[PDB]
Amino acid sequence: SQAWQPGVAMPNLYKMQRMLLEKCDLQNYGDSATLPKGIMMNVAKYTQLCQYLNTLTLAVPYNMRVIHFGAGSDKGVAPGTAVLRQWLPTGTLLVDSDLNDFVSDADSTLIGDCATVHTANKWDLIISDMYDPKTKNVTKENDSKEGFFTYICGFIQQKLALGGSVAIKITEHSWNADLYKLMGHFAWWTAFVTNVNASSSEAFLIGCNYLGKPREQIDGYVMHANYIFWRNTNPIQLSSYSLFDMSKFPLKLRGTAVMSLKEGQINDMILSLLSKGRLIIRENNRVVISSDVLVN
Amino acid sequence: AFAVDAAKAYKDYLASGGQPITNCVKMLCTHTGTGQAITVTPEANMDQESFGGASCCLYCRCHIDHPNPKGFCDLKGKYVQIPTTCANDPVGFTLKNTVCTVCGMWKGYGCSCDQ
Ligand SMILES: Nc1ncnc2c1ncn2[C@@H]1O[C@H](CSCc2cc(C(=O)O)cc(-c3cccnc3)c2)[C@@H](O)[C@H]1O
Ligand SMILES: [Zn+2]
Ligand SMILES: [Zn+2]
């Protein structure tokens, strides 16, 4: 049984289907996991996400660069950032961001719409919890959403280092076809459901080891329909079991090599290293970020 | 010469019977750590909870300046270990207590340097 895992990843055979989109109707829709005393859902959720990312071939260089979108809470703190900072190697540069003001353990925080965020550098890992609850409109067609997803797709294409990875929150109604298409530009991808939030249609779309080119052609409308079909026919037992064993939680510092290479210099030998989590391709200059301010 | 004294205001509101600041960010951890007060990663022992530092800092949480020429926060970006019996008010605890500068434990909650 999968109740002792941090969560459940979308099985490969479901990715290969050609389902039509239907309403998501989760058997366990009503239920909630019993969290450890005083632990909040967002800490438990990010802990299980990080426990699952521990099983993938993430590139972990020295001076790793991680950016976290949607990091604020309506309480004005950043529990997901706190888990990321616990998980990442000491000295990892962590930047977070949200529309609304909050206090954070990140090295730097930008407040404003994510579209106002600009960075000089590329990043090794992009995490997004962004979600617009106004998308959960059950009385209209569930079409691909733009808003912050448009920004995220461009940010991945422009500012994710080759070999880098991504985890972007989606739900039944909060999703984007181009982002699914972009999953085919990584060596591997999945939709991951935390066991603690398995009663929700949320998942994290994880792209593992970015290659900067289409490895697979993915139709994003079909794939989201495939995701819902998987969720509709595979009830996931709510579980907080994995939260009680943190002895192997920290991300393994692999010291992954970082090189600066130009587009015509990407061997299939390089693509293999990228695909195995053994190489990061980006410049290694100083990390500079900024937020555009609109003046009246 | 005027300066807002938030630490005194919070202490006085606590003594008056007010509800402590909530939503401090409690971490999952092994609870087999060093027990030191303020650390780079969670270090709670069996008797402690570990919290994200920024969420336990009065000045961060109230959006007010930190009381230092260097407007520096020694909790932000770190984890603070709070004795489990005091974990209902982590902000009040970090305000009212002192870290021993030789062993790194809380004075009177782990520091044995005086025995
Ligand atoms: N374009 C963007 N740029 C930058 N930040 C962005 C952008 N869009 C969204 N965010 C941020 O993402 C974080 C996660 S959404 C949390 C949430 C969940 C639910 C849920 O689950 O029902 C419901 C709400 C909610 C919101 C408003 C009113 N009633 C309920 C919120 C948040 O702190 C947002 O400010
Ligand atoms: Zn502070
Ligand atoms: Zn001492």
Task: Select the residue of A39, A105, A107 nearest B52 (Cβ to Cβ).
Answer: A105
Contact (Cβ atoms closer than 8 angstroms) between residue A65 and residue A287? yes
Q: How far apart are CA A102 and CA A75, in angstroms?
A: 8
Q: How far apart are CA A50 and CA A194, in angstroms?
A: 10
- In DSSP terms, A109 is beta-bridged to A96
Q: How far apart are CA B68 and CA B14, in angstroms?
A: 24
Q: How far apart are CA A186 and CA A216, in angstroms?
A: 9
Helices (H), chain A: 12-15, 41-53, 79-87, 147-159, 177-183, 220-233, 268-275
Ligand 1 pocket check for A99: Cβ under 6 Å:
yes
Cβ neighbours of residue B5 closer than 8 Å, sequence gap 6 or more: none
With b meaning 16 or more CB within 10 Å and e meaning fewer, what string describes A217-239?
ebebbbbbbbbbbbbbeeebbbb
- A32 to A46, A48, A150, A240, B38: CA distances (angstroms): 16, 15, 32, 10, 33
Q: Which residue of B has its CA nearest to A106?
A: B77
Question: For strand A203-210 and strand A7-9, is the pairing parallel, antiparallel, or unpaired?
Answer: unpaired
DSSP calls for A17-72: --PPP-----TTTT----PPTT--HHHHHHHHHHHHHTTS-----TT-EEEEES--
Task: Select the residue of A40, A105, A246 nearest B54 (Cβ to Cβ).
Answer: A105
Rounded to the nearest angstrom, the minimum Cα separation between B115 and chain A is 33
Q: For this experimental structure, what is the resolution in angstroms? A: 2.0
Nearest to A47 by CA among A84, A96, A92: A84
Token pair for residue A22? 């239907």
- In DSSP terms, A8 is beta-bridged to A193
If you search the block for the tokens 């790194």, which residue do you land on? B104
The single-letter code of the amino acid at A136 is K
Token pair for residue A77? 């703190």
Q: Which of A99, A127, A149 to mutate to test the pocket of ligand 1 (most atoms within 8 A of CB)?
A: A99
Token pair for residue B76? 């932000």
Contact (Cβ atoms closer than 8 angstroms) between residue A147 and residue A133? no
Tell me the backbone φ, ψ of residue A210, rounded to 5 degrees. -60, 135
What architecture is the A16-291 domain classified under in CATH? Answer: 3-Layer(aba) Sandwich (3.40)
User: SS3 letters for chain B?
Assistant: CCCCCHHHHHHHHHHCCCCCCCCCCECCCCCCCCCCCEECCCCCCCCEEEEECHHHCHHHHHCCCCCCCCCCCCCCCCEEEEEHHHCCCHHHHHHHCCECCCCCCECCCCCCCCC
The DSSP symbol for A159 reads: H
The structure was resolved experimentally with X-ray
Contact (Cβ atoms closer than 8 angstroms) between residue B47 and residue B35? yes
Q: Among the options A15, A145, A159, A169, which is catalytic? A: A169
The single-letter code of the amino acid at B4 is V
Q: How far apart are CA A16 and CA A13, in angstroms?
A: 5
Tell me the backbone φ, ψ of residue A214, rounded to 5 degrees. -65, 115
Q: How far apart are CA A180 and CA A222, in angstroms?
A: 9
